[PDB]
Symmetry: D2
Subunit: 249 residues, 4 copies
């Protein structure tokens, strides 16, 4: 058919933090376009819920990214059940905001490990298969903070800017072999949180966003799905900013 290349069938997609919000939006979108999605979560309850909504189109698994041992059996589980990972989506970002003078060492370490080093560990683990296949996608869910900096979020900003630098390097290494490594940088996105924010709080967030709204989880998903698709094979080492104009370039 015309648009035959547009399908994701035959492709295996690994999405981290797929329990809610963006991550769930990504997994659902990829499945809707024909891919088998494996979503991962931090707890065993998180994994089961993911398996629930993926149903027959994929699998939930509990992956504790920080533990290198956790990665190995999760990838092996996928290889045995589905196969090698065609598409890696790194979406396991947390936040531990504080100003610098009040910032605890653990809050710095846990942000660096969960948001920055998680990317390196997972990218490495899926790297080799995509190089044999000569086709691959790595997309990391970044943040406008990494570009702009935000007071009280120096750890976040450091992690989110680091994964851009990490991606550009990886891109240069694997570009020649049909692998793509990009970042999607969201602005304020509406979540399970935000709905309980106060009118004053919600106003102050909106003042920052020229578009005058918060973005949708799906808006991030559709960026990710385009970049993970066969018509984005010429984009690597790039950051696709989805923030309603809160920042530019």
């Amino acid at each position: 058919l015309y648009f035959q290349s547009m399908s994701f069938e035959g492709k295996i997609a690994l999405v981290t933090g797929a329990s809610r919000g963006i991550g769930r939006a990504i997994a659902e979108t990829l499945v809707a376009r024909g891919a088998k999605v494996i979503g991962t979560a931090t707890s065993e309850n998180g994994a089961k819920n993911i398996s629930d909504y993926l149903g027959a189109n994929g699998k939930g698994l509990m992956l504790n990214v920080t533990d290198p041992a956790s990665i190995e059996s999760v990838l092996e589980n996928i290889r045995a059940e589905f196969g090698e990972v065609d598409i890696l989506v790194n979406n396991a970002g947390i936040t531990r905001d504080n100003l610098l003078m009040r910032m605890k060492d653990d809050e710095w370490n846990d942000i660096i490990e969960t948001n920055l080093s998680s990317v390196f560990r997972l990218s490495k683990a899926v790297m080799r298969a995509m190089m044999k296949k000569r086709c691959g996608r790595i997309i990391t869910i970044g943040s406008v903070v990494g570009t702009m900096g935000n007071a009280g979020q120096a750890n976040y900003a450091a992690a989110k800017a680091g994964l851009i630098g990490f991606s550009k390097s990886l891109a240069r290494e694997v570009a020649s072999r049909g692998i793509t490594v990009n970042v999607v940088a969201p602005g304020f996105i509406e979540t399970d949180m935000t709905r309980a924010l106060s009118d004053d709080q919600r106003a102050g967030i909106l003042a920052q966003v020229p578009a005058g709204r918060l973005g949708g989880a799906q808006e991030i998903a559709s960026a990710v799905a385009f970049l993970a698709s066969d018509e984005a094979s010429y984009i690597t080492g790039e950051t696709l900013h989805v923030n309603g104009g809160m920042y530019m370039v």
Copy 2:
């Protein structure tokens, strides 16, 4: 389908990028007006667009010619939903050899045309509270290129334009973005020598030249309803030639 009931103006749609954009939109359900400098240009456009659209003669540097094409489109189709600025030429030279008119032509055709055509479509977009303005820039504007300072000013300047404009119209559901292609295989690049081509390909980690559809796919995404939260942004499609 995806652009059900949307009217798109693609300037410079005779070939390459422009033709690939027009057809991608038509293939996804838009009425498409594609533009050319010449009669046969416009005629041949209308030929390949057939029932899904129409080719018109447009001179992006002439205010009167803009006035007629848009007034022409309004009469028969309606108001423009999606504007793609893909006019743009080169006149390369080192600075020390660049003629004043080689500068001015590149400025008029590749930068000031972006101002004229966007202003002309925006009133209606502001009123409708929805829209898309998309401009085809170039890696050159971000990276700079010896022998192309006029191109680099124009392609850089269309980004600064887009940003400001994107701030003026963000609140009313209009996005304004730039797709910045790297080296895209064209007639002229197939005409290069073996040694020149090697020099091009050496700059591109991906190891190939890009295809026009690759730009077309990027533009259709940004013009779609799923790209609504992206404004004032530059989507680089250069195979790794340059990064961020």
Copy 3:
């Protein structure tokens, strides 16, 4: 001092940044030729430069005046070692109300001026394998700003020009760089309501408006021998209003 024996050409040197640049360069041992739009401006410019330089009337849009000015500089002083391009103007308006003329004037004065003046001083710089071209841009060209789509097209455009030019002449000991002021205190800003100056200060983490001298110090640094490994770069001096 740092600039002994060097000849500097500072365009728009009547007041503000232009004057502060001219004064700093004199302080540090340079013979400076400042320009102004009027013969009266040149009067004042010569008045404050004294035996360290001279004022001249220069119309950056007119090739005829560009040549005349350069002949007189070569006659009375020698070959321009340092070109500082600071002949910017403003014509703010929203896109819907921007006149064709407000666009063109900004593009001519603020962008195309950098092309003509850089081109005119460049040959001598390459003959001596040493030189400095520094253009005064604006944060607006990087972040964009509603009502300043013409100014931002230009301020961004001159960065694309500088990146290309830098690549053409790096091999020959010349640097081409841009200094980007955020909000700088001028007589125009001093004249603003308390509400307006509050709104500006909210945008600037440093709590203040920058000073003309602060821009000059960045220019003086880039023009020095301590910046000879810096080319193609933008130096943002905006108290944190925008970052990178």
Copy 4:
């Protein structure tokens, strides 16, 4: 534009960039504490600083060592007015061969160090409502480099960190900045193949490797009272290797 009465702490001051930073501030009136990871390197720093400062041993990945140095410095000198983070190392490998600790050591030596040292001198700079933080980055953090993904992630992270700390302390008259060297001639550099050196020079329009003093000047300018309106900015010193 002296640094009289100022106390500057340059981590990684044994040789090269850090020793030129250290020496240059001394020459402009600063008392300087230079650091190294071994007590011998700390000895050699004391020797060349002599009367104008002192060397000390600092393990930037250890909070204990950080406190020991800083309380020492408060004793003999006072509070740190100026902080230069020049304590990068590399641990190069393509991603498939990069081991966990090779990733971890570079993140902790080149990025978390910036966090730990910056917090460590921040409070005193906040009470005095004046300060300077400058981190030595790398063009690699901006453009990315194959086989350097850990180095680039860190060198980029420290720009993101610097941007938000700048926002936190800008209103109290402290700037936080990055200098991003390109290829800088070192002892390790002069000792490579002609083939290697030629391949480094291939990437630099300036035609040459940068010097350690050139980076020191950028740092010296940024730490001066003339750079008070620059914060959250990266200043790229790379011969045009990369642009903006």
